[PDB]
Design a protein around this nucleic acid. Structure first.
Lengths: 600, 138, 476, 757
RNA sequence: UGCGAAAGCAGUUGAAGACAAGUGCUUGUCGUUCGUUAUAAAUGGCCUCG
């Protein structure tokens, strides 16, 4: 999963209503019909400017524009392509409100103007759905009225939800049937939720419920695939349709630090259980099922970025993992300029693989049983050790072994308690600062045998202990997760015969033939030739290592002169090896007349 | 019953030259014609025919030899020299191949089985020599 | 108590084609050019050879009708869909229509052109219309009623047209393939005489066949390509053939594990089977003495023994065939209760299996080494005795006379990879069990001397195999 | 929330007393001969012979008196002694309990208590209102005393009167009628026969007179008696020897008659009621009816196990009752009771409990006596040494795994036990075996192994697993070569894929892979794939070399094939490998030796932290939920959040689990639900003042991440295995073969009279 | 027997009592004990119902 760099669609006009950045997302509407995974067009209603259709690819361009007076506020916009009485047409429906005195519902038809119609709406228009199949336009009003119109804006049906001051209405389709649910604030933070089915009445009420503790004033709402998401005070509340029952509450600590009033937050869905969250100029891709931050991007060149709409992927059925999201970006400076921007988003595969190690949420051995059967203070130690004088080996070892009751200079199964990594790392840091040069404490030898030796300290380890042979030998035999790069470098650099065999045995045991072979190519041709000369001068772990060399070196790089000496050597060993095999197997494995002397 | 037996090493689902006859037989999947070419035992002929054989056709030749050896193990020896020279001569071409094990899976399995006999054959040989030495001196 | 367990001792598509075991090679006077199968029972097939057409009985596999009226060479023997009527072409250009199984009478005779008429085929959906192709390069469409003028005269081939095909489910469409390398599609519904479109084969077209309503397979030159008319492009192409492919036939919905099969002649002596489902990939092939000019297989509804027919330029005709107390019978239909307990007898056991069941360990080993005994079967009895823990027991009461049969097989079995390990075990015991008898028996001694040479030879091969194994790793 | 309760049954009970031979079977056939009563270690089952089903079950736990009393049943007698479906149960201690079958068990049975002074009741019997009891009192030879039992109505008490006494009883037998007793004593040895209700028969003679001189020349096997039978009339006595030779002795004049067919020791001898036929059985797995008139013999071969006991059970000898041993399983003695119809020698009723194979022998189990000491048998001398060695191993040694592999069929919930070379399908809901299938080649039922043939080892089914769909069965087998050969050390590892339609009961083998992963390399771990990948038709197999192989079922091939491989040729070996797969199928967690790796499934290689080091070798890796992963090492267990890559909880296991179990068995001790949480099971030896044989197990329910203990329960015996049923409840198998569960008018008068008539 | 991988690495196979045979002495055995992690061989082979 990744977030692409935003690319510019258009620059918003310098209108007073758009000057208020915090409410700016409210003044820009995105048509649902034209903005999806497969569409290359976006229809956007910019209040007081126009309703404009742009093509995204290959380059952003303005394809159509319908001007609107500056004093009109766009409250709802939608555009859909279809067949009307049959010609292919694009039906545009938008609602504008002028000073709250009058509300205008307008329908425009374009050939792919064929006709333009306008009526007075009783109240503010928030959601507009275009049914091209039935040639219908459906509008939801603030007085709770759901009015169905044709393309000529002739009222065909009207439904009253019995509740006023509606705030949220979202359309969705399930199993081929069109559905809408609405949220109407009530007093005392109570909200009426209603679910309606579109088919004497084409609108059927399926569910009506009141949800307690649901505030709107500081809550951001979005819906996706039968789930309603509410972001409030850093906690995302997940409600499940058709009953809108609360399922899960997910805490988002990175939002809990936000001072109330200054930080601008937008919240939109992008895929199944995945949403986009923006905090000022930082954009987050979140996985809500696993509660992991899939991706994060900061837009240093803009003050704030507000999500307007996102093309949501149905990842369960769609093999495509790439979508787009459109938002408004505000530049830094004395004369801030707000512009429309689109971001390409890679949601991912929706698997636990994506969310591995990316949680946005931030030990001691405990007895198995709290309380006649057969039996088979880290900080204090750190403080005591750190207080020691420089280069005092005897005191350092005495404190470590005595305090921890360690009986052997090497790790044993009875030392499971010390296995806390934090204490070991500090002791390792102390040993380096406390001691340098040629004398190290015995505590280092114990740590080298510890299975949980920190990975951070494995690098350059062989170099530090190169001076002391025994300590180097201990590292080869027992030190865990030693890098192969250092092991191979020390393989070809060390002339000690004993160390070479141990290094050979360690490399094979912990690393694959394929993994070793690639690094061997990086080694210089001279070093491998020197190693070959050493061989010509348990042995399989050296020879099998040599066979890896002959594979790494390759056919061309080998030289005939040295190759002959190697051939003479190998033929010598094969004769001997066959001879010994014969020895091993061997270890595993009457006359008619006869003359005899009688004893008497 | 009718269950299909297999092994874990089946990496399948994971003048005097006869070069022209060999190339035609390999292209046409002609089992009879290929058999006549493989009938020769003269090592000098084997190198020369493989030497002039086009590198592309060499890969399938290894496949055909792998199958023929597997069906009849008695011909493992005589067909090994065919394989041995193919690797030597066309080694450069074989290196520049995206995948070998999948296409040379049969060869590796066939060669693996022969090596497994070596540890036990030595054990049998030592006991034969131990008894063979015994009566010969007696 | 439980019944005693029984001792336990390619592709299905290949196994089906292996059932055409019976082979008959008939000799004809000249090259057999065309072979056709009667669509109706008994599905007798006709072969065009020299100046005569011979119909062969399916069951009898011998000639039953001969049409020798033709003066010059004959070029076709295709039957009509009903099978009553067969048409034939002649080098003189006369097209002669005879009643099947009534050679004497000539129902209709048409002079297509002065040049030879190589192809004459009945139109599959419509019985009345007959198509003829000539070296005049006009593939005239004749009707049985109208014998004085063709219904339609398709033209536009600049070389010989020797391949006519009729597309199933498209009776208006007609396909022609000329030695220009162009396969032309015509529509009889329109005025015709001009192709709808042409398909380029790049090589002379020897036979065009419509496998399915939308797929046509055109075999020309050294390869055959399958074309889809909706896409108007070759989907797939196969060039496994060496010589120039000549003839091609298709059969569908027959009793094989493969629903459909596609046979194509090679002119190299090869005819190979292709299945349309698996991207037209090879599954089987047969080799003949000489080049194959015509191949045919019995229709789907043969209703009896299936036949595979191959035609060779030498005149040899090769046929492969896949062959297909008055109350004792009461059966108790009217009775209240039927009680059944009869249990069929187990499959007959061999001598070695009986001996093992009866605990005859030594005799079981003897049955292993008998003349005319399968090598695989000899391996099982040896493995069984080892599994039973009876190896020394089977070898106790033996001397040199009865030990040589085992050593003879071991001398040969050591070469086999499968039996190499088994031979080592048995040979190890007999040496450990008959060391003293070995010294006093000369014949046994030589049985080891050659064995030591052979086991040494295997050691060299296994060492050699390890070396090729080593270098093969280097390449990868 | 959770609760523990026993569900299924256990092993059938036997009179496990060394001296008594031929009276081992305690089950009885009703007087109407319409049902068979069999005592189990934890219940009494009444099976209807005609329909071959368990019509009634009397569980000791349900009844208070039986729960307090249950000590083992020494006999069952039809009817009530004190006084038509009553039975009197006599236990070894002396409790006499009058129960009823064919009805509802009464919560107040007529409990009584025979008075015995330092005596262990061994056997009881009757002919007509007269009752005798045999009791054991204490050279390693127990002595016997014969009392006479009578019930006095006034005092409602059982009174015992001394009748007879014998010392140093080596072997004993009672006639079929139950009125004569033959016994061998060391007073080398002498045989004496005594009439038990009368003084008519009283004879004794040294065994030396019976024994042939050639036997005195030969080894001790020829002179060692393993079986003894006495005729009803007392005229004949059959002695069976460890050599396999039977000798019928005519008691009137001590004339001998030798019958020789058994190649190995004869274990069971029994006379017919008329005395004209002799049932014999032994290691051959073949029951022989010797016709004594003509010395002929009829055979019933290929029985399920070696015959411990034979009896002719009926007024006219309608049935034969046999006890079978199944000596393949050395860990436990697997007894099976077989009731055969004498007419056609077909199994009229076969009864046996669950047959688990534990890793090591348990409690005081001793293999049966044979002519030679083998892996499946004890010689005459080896018996005492083996008993002492077994007790010393159970006391002093520290390796006490006794852990068994068991599987649950998802579709059917049947319980699969991998018996040696065969799988036992056992339905714990009905508490009846449903099938026994041979899943390997080998000498399994072709013949009865005898003497050195008994040293052969049949293929061992090591791992047995089902796919999530449940339609496929994956089996892993090891075939052991015979000894004394060049190829006597090259084990053959086999993998087999079986399939079965739900309606049928027999698995059909579909594919077979010989030497998977290479030659002589074990398949240490197998994990069927999750439902996400290939719809649960794939599996992973992992070696001790760190190699992984992914097989899947391809429809085109119509058989399984090796889709993916990762063969890192590590140079070290370790049997401590565990394997887990994410539910989605994206990641696979492979723990080898001390290191855990996260391999992406698509590339089947490491993700691009993948490597996690543990203090000691990994025994188990499991993910209770997609978020959390529980990793168990030999010294502790830890919970890790994959999302955070941090340890939440760590619990020390070293005090309880240090070297008690071999590597890989903690996998079968630990299981996890996919919804609620996981479960950990810890067994501790119990000792007071050196370790004792008895064990105590503790089960702990843990929530995901092991934050809290949902429940902590204690069971009084060593729990061999615990797994999670596909319902919420967990099923655990206990070395007593007990499967428990831890989970959340004139007309009316005339009608009655007519019914009576 | 312990550990471990399957290869292998370490470590054991003692004392008393009784009986038999041979000549107090010798040998062999143990349905006898204590302690330690700690060849075989009684001519004797598997049913019937096609």
């Amino acid at each position: 999963p990744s977030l692409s760099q935003p690319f510019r669609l258009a620059t918003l006009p310098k209108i007073a209503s758009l000057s208020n950045f915090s409410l700016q997302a409210d003044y820009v509407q995105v048509a649902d019909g034209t903005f999806n995974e497969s569409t290359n067009n976006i229809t956007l209603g910019i209040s007081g400017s126009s309703i404009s259709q742009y093509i995204i690819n290959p380059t952003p361009k303005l394809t159509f524009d319908y001007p609107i007076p500056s004093t009109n506020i766009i409250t709802a916009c939608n555009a859909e392509k279809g067949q009307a009485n049959k010609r292919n047409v694009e039906i545009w429906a938008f609602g504008l409100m002028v000073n709250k005195g009058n509300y205008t519902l307008n329908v425009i038809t374009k050939a792919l103007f064929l006709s333009q119609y306008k009526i007075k709406a009783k109240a503010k228009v928030m959601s507009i759905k275009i049914d091209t199949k039935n040639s219908l336009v459906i509008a939801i009003l603030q007085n709770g009225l759901i009015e169905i119109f044709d393309f000529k804006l002739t009222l065909l049906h009207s439904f009253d939800i019995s509740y006023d001051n509606l705030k949220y209405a979202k359309w969705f389709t399930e199993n081929g049937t069109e559905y809408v649910f609405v949220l109407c604030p009530l007093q005392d933070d109570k909200v009426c939720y209603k679910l309606l089915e579109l088919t004497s009445s084409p609108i059927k009420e399926l569910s009506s419920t009141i949800i307690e503790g649901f505030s709107f004033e500081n809550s951001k709402l979005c819906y996706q695939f039968g789930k309603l998401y509410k972001l409030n005070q850093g906690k995302i509340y997940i409600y499940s349709l058709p009953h809108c029952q609360l399922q899960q509450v997910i805490e988002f600590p990175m939002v809990d630090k936000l001072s109330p009033g200054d930080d601008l937050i937008s919240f939109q869905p992008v895929s199944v259980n995945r949403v986009l969250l923006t905090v000022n100029n930082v954009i987050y891709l979140l996985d809500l099922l696993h509660c992991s931050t899939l991706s994060q991007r900061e837009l240093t060149h803009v003050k704030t970025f507000q999500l307007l709409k996102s093309a949501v992927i149905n990842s369960e059925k769609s093999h495509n993992s790439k979508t787009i999201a459109i938002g408004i970006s505000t530049k830094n400076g004395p004369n801030p300029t707000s512009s429309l921007e689109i971001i390409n988003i890679d949601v991912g595969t929706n698997t636990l693989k994506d969310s591995l190690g990316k949680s946005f949420q931030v030990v001691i051995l405990k007895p198995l049983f709290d309380d006649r059967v057969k039996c088979n203070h880290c900080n204090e130690v750190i403080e005591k050790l750190s207080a020691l004088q420089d280069n005092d080996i005897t005191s350092f070892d005495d404190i470590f072994f005595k305090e921890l009751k360690i009986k052997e200079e090497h790790y044993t199964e009875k030392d499971r308690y010390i296995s806390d990594p934090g204490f070991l790392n500090k002791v390792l840091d102390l040993i380096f600062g406390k001691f340098s040069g040629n004398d190290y404490p015995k505590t280092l030898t114990f740590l080298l045998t510890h299975p949980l030796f920190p990975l951070s300290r494995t690098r350059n380890l062989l170099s530090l202990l190169r001076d002391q042979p025994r300590l180097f030998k201990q590292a080869i035999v027992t030190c865990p997760n030693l890098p192969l790069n250092e092991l191979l470098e020390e393989l070809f650099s060390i002339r000690n015969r004993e160390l070479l065999l141990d290094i050979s045995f360690r490399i094979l045991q912990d690393f694959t033939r394929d993994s070793i072979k690639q690094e061997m190519k990086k080694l210089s041709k001279l070093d491998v030739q020197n190693f070959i000369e050493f061989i010509t001068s348990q042995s399989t772990q050296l020879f099998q290592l040599l066979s890896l060399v002959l594979d790494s070196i390759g056919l061309f790089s080998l030289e005939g002169a040295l190759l002959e000496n190697l051939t003479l050597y190998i033929d010598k060993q094969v004769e001997i090896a066959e001879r010994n095999t014969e020895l091993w197997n061997l270890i595993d494995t009457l006359p008619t007349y006869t003359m005899e002397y009688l004893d008497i | 019953g009718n269950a299909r037996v297999t092994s874990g090493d089946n990496f399948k689902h994971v003048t005097g030259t006869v070069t022209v006859i060999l190339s035609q037989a390999l292209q046409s999947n002609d089992h009879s014609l290929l058999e006549t070419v493989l009938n020769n035992r003269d090592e000098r002929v084997i190198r020369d025919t493989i030497f002039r054989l086009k590198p592309a056709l060499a890969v399938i030749l290894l496949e055909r030899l792998a199958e023929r050896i597997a069906r009849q193990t008695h011909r493992q020896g005589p067909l090994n020299v065919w394989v041995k020279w193919c690797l030597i001569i066309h080694g450069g071409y074989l290196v520049s191949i995206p995948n070998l094990m999948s296409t040379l899976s049969s060869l590796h399995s066939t060669l693996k089985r022969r090596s497994d006999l070596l540890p036990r054959l030595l054990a049998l040989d030592a006991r034969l020599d131990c008894t063979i030495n015994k009566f010969k001196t007696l | 108590s439980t019944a005693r367990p029984r001792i336990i001792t390619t592709t299905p598509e290949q196994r089906y084609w292996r059932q055409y075991t019976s082979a008959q090679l008939v000799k004809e006077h000249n090259s057999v050019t065309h072979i056709s199968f009667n669509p109706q029972h008994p599905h007798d097939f006709a072969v065009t050879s020299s100046t005569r057409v011979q119909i062969f009985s399916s069951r009898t596999r011998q000639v039953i009708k001969t049409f020798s009226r033709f003066k010059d060479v004959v070029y076709s023997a295709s039957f009509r869909s009903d099978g009553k009527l067969l048409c034939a072409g002649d080098a003189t250009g006369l097209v002669s229509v005879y009643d099947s199984y009534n050679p004497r009478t000539i129902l209709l005779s048409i002079n297509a052109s002065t040049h030879p008429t190589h192809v004459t085929k009945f139109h599959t959906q419509d019985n009345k219309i007959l198509a003829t192709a000539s070296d005049d390069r006009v593939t005239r469409l004749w009707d049985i009623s109208n014998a004085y003028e063709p219904q339609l005269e398709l033209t536009g081939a600049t070389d010989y047209v020797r391949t006519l095909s009729f597309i199933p489910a498209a009776p208006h469409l007609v396909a022609t393939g000329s030695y220009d390398g162009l396969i032309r599609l015509y529509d009889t519904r329109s005025s015709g005489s001009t192709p709808i479109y042409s398909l380029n084969h790049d090589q002379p077209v020897e036979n065009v066949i419509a496998v399915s309503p939308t797929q046509i397979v055109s075999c020309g030159g050294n390869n055959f390509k399958v074309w889809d008319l909706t896409s108007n492009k070759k989907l797939y192409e196969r060039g496994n053939f060496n010589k120039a492919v000549t003839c091609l036939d298709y059969v569908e919905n027959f009793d094989s594990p493969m629903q459909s099969a596609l046979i194509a002649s090679s002119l190299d002596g090869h005819v190979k089977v292709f299945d349309p489902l698996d991207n037209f990939q090879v599954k089987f092939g047969w080799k003949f003495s000489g080049p194959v000019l015509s191949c045919a297989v019995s229709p789907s509804t043969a209703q009896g023994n299936r036949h595979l027919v191959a035609g060779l330029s030498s005149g040899l005709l090769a046929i492969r065939t896949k062959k297909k107390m008055r109350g004792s019978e009461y059966q108790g239909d009217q009775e209240h209760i039927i009680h059944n307990d009869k249990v069929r007898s187990q499959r007959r056991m061999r001598a070695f299996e009986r001996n093992i069941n009866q605990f005859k360990w030594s005799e079981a080993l003897d049955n292993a080494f008998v003349p005319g005994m399968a090598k695989e079967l000899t391996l099982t009895v040896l493995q069984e005795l080892r599994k039973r823990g009876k190896v020394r027991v089977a070898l106790y009461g033996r001397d040199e006379s009865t030990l040589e049969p085992l050593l003879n097989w071991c001398l040969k079995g050591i070469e086999d990879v499968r039996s190499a390990s088994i031979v080592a075990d048995w040979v190890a015991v007999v040496l450990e069990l008959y060391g003293n008898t070995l010294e006093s028996s000369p014949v046994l001694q030589e049985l080891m001397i050659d064995l030591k040479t052979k086991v040494r030879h295997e050691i060299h091969k296994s060492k050699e195999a390890q070396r090729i194994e080593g270098m093969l790793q280097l390449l990868t | 929330q959770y609760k523990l309760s026993v569900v299924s049954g256990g092993k059938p009970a036997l009179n496990n007393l060394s001296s008594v031979t031929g009276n081992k079977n305690i089950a009885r056939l009703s007087q109407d001969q319409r049902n068979y009563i069999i005592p189990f270690n934890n219940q009494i089952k009444v099976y209807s012979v005609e329909t071959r089903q368990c019509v009634k079950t009397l569980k000791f736990a349900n009844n208070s008196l039986l729960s307090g009393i249950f000590e083992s049943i020494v006999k069952i007698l039809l009817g009530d002694i004190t006084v038509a479906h009553l039975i009197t149960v006599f236990t070894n201690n002396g409790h006499v309990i009058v129960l009823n079958y064919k009805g509802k068990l009464v919560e107040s049975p007529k409990h009584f208590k025979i008075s015995l002074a330092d005596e262990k009741l061994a056997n009881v019997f009757h002919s007509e209102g007269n009752y005798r009891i045999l009791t054991t009192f204490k050279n390693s030879l127990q002595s016997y005393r014969l009392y006479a039992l009578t019930f006095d109505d006034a005092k409602k008490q059982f009174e015992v009167a001394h009748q007879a006494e014998w010392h140093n009883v080596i072997l004993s037998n009672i006639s079929s009628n139950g009125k004569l007793l033959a016994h061998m004593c060391k007073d080398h040895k002498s045989i004496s026969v005594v009439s038990l209700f009368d003084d008519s028969v009283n004879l004794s003679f040294p065994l030396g007179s019976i024994l042939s001189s050639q036997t005195q020349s030969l080894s001790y096997n020829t002179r060692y008696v393993s079986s003894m039978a006495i005729d009803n009339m007392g005229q004949q006595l059959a002695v069976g020897f460890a050599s396999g030779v039977i000798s019928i002795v005519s008691l009137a004049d001590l004339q001998i008659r030798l019958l020789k067919w058994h190649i190995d020791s004869v274990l069971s001898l029994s006379f017919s009621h008329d005395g004209s036929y002799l049932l014999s059985g032994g290691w051959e797995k073949v029951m022989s009816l010797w016709q004594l008139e003509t010395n002929s013999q009829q055979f019933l071969p290929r029985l399920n196990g070696i015959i411990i006991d034979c009896q002719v059970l009926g007024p006219q000898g309608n049935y034969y009752s046999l006890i079978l041993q199944m000596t393949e399983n050395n860990s436990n003695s697997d007894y099976q009771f077989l009731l055969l119809n004498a007419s056609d020698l077909t199994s009229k009723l076969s009864i046996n409990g669950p047959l688990p194979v534990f890793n090591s022998t348990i409690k005081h189990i001793q293999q049966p006596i044979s002519a030679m000491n083998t892996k499946n048998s004890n010689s005459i001398t080896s018996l005492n040494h083996s008993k002492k060695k077994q007790s010393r191993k159970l006391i002093k040694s520290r390796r006490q795994d006794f852990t068994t592999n068991v599987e649950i069929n998802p579709i059917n919930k049947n319980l699969y036990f991998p018996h040696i070379s065969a799988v036992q399908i056992f339905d714990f809901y009905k508490n009846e075996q449903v099938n026994y299938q041979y899943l390997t080649s080998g000498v399994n039922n072709s013949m009865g192994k005898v003497r050195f043939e008994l040293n052969l080892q049949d293929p061992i089914i090591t791992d047995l697993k089902f796919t999530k769909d449940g339609q496929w069965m994956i089996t892993y087998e090891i075939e052991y070569p015979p000894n004394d050969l060049l190829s006597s050390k090259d084990l053959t590892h086999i993998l087999k894929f079986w399939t079965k339609n739900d309606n049928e009961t027999n698995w059909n083998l579909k594919t077979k892979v010989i030497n998977p992963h290479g030659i002589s390399v074990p398949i240490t771990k197998i994990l069927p794939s999750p439902r996400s990948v290939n719809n649960s038709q794939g599996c992973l197999t992992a070696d001790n070399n760190g190699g992984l192989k992914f097989w899947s079922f391809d429809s085109h091939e119509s058989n399984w094939c090796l889709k993916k491989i990762s063969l890192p040729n590590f140079n070290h070996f370790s049997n401590s490998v565990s394997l887990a797969w994410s539910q989605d199928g994206s990641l696979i967690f492979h723990g080898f030796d001390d290191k855990l790796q996260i391999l992406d499934f698509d590339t089947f290689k490491k993700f691009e932290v993948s490597e996690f080091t543990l203090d000691s070798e990994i025994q188990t890796v499991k993910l209770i939920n997609d978020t959390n992963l529980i990793v168990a090492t030999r010294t502790t267990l830890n919970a890790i959040n994959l999302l955070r890559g941090q340890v939440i909880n760590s619990f020390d296991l070293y005090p309880f689990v240090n070297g008690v179990y071999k590597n890989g068995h903690m996998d079968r001790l630990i299981t996890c639900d996919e919804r609620t949480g996981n479960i950990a099971l810890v067994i501790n030896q119990q000792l007071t003042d050196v370790p004792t044989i008895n064990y105590k197990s503790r089960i702990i329910i843990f929530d995901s991440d092991l934050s809290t203990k949902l429940g902590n329960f204690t069971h009084h015996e060593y729990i061999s295995w615990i797994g999670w049923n596909y319902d919420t409840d967990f099923i655990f198998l206990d070395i007593e073969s007990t499967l428990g569960v831890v989970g959340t008018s004139n007309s009316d008068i005339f009608a009655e009279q007519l019914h009576k008539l």
